[PDB]
């Protein structure tokens, strides 16, 4: 309801590997830049040229926005700095550029960089700094602390049913608003992320190929019933024609 998440909110995108977490974050940043705003995207596991190439196949143009001075793409391994200096660099850079959208991809990369309570302290400080300035934070997390401090939560699924893997996503949490409660199936393509029409059937909860199979089965059943009604109509009408012939005689 209302057209999306609230502005200065904290949004967590969660899922397994290959789910589409990076693609969604890049879509967020690319839209932010397309409206003329500024975005910062902190990647801890992929390089800048590689990320640009990877996003190019999904129809995004992250290079246009880098060359236009509206998107700063920063890439550094979790082992390059200490947990203190990671925070220091992030805060300094955020200060200078004055972004509108900041993405951290992934938040789960720092698990082995220290103790749980140290990495939690760092991440909490990052989140508080972003929220006190009205900057929208998009955090990507791998599924398998600070979840509680998130205003929205998008869970992306890629599961095996019927010898195929189908993508899905739902909104676990969106505070302050009304939102759909459907586990919707989507596809990736050269046109970005497209969500398929909702599933309508008495059974429901079918995805991918099974959906088409059930559509075909329903069509077949409808044809069967139509033929049954047709034969019944024809039989009663033949009885009527009979009654005619006898009356004439």
């Amino acid at each position: 309801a209302g057209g999306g998440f609230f502005r200065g909110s904290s949004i967590l995108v969660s899922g397994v590997a290959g789910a589409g977490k990076s693609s969604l974050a890049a879509h967020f940043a690319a839209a932010a830049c397309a409206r003329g705003e500024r975005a910062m995207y902190f990647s801890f596991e992929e390089a800048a040229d590689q990320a640009v190439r990877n996003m190019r196949s999904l129809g995004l143009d992250l290079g246009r926005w880098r060359d236009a001075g509206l998107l700063r793409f920063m890439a550094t391994r979790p082992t390059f700095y200490s947990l203190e200096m990671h925070l220091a660099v992030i805060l300094r850079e955020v200060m200078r550029f004055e972004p509108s959208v900041v993405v951290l991809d992934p938040i789960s990369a720092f698990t082995e960089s220290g103790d749980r309570l140290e990495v939690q302290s760092m991440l909490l400080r990052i989140v508080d700094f972003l929220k006190n300035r009205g900057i929208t934070g998009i955090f990507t997390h791998l599924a398998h602390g600070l979840e509680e401090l998130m205003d929205g939560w998008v869970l992306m699924l890629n599961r095996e049913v019927n010898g195929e893997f189908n993508r899905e996503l739902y909104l676990l949490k969106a505070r302050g608003m009304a939102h759909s409660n459907q586990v919707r199936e989507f596809l990736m393509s050269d046109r970005g992320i497209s969500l398929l029409p909702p599933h309508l059937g008495e059974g429901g909860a079918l995805t991918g190929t099974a959906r088409k199979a059930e559509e075909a089965r329903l069509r077949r059943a409808e044809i069967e019933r139509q033929t049954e009604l047709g034969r019944l109509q024809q039989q009663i009408e033949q009885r009527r024609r009979r009654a005619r012939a006898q009356i004439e005689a």
């Binding site: 309801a1 009304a178 939102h179 759909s180 459907q182 909702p198 599933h199 309508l200 059937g201 008495e202 009604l229 019944l232 109509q233 009663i236 009408e237 009885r239 009527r240 009654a243 005619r244 006898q246 009356i247």
Partner: protein
């Protein structure tokens, strides 16, 4: 024979009425289901 054919006519009528009612009820049920799964409520 006339009475028989009148009975047949009534049967034809009842069958057509039942089919029309079934079509109607399926459309109503489909609309209900597509409502309980749609994003209209958020436009």
């Amino acid at each position: 024979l006339e009475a028989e054919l009148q009975a047949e006519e009534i049967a034809l009528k009842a069958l057509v009425e039942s089919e029309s009612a079934h079509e109607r009820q399926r459309l109503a049920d489909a609309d209900t289901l597509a409502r309980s799964r749609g994003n209209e409520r958020f436009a």
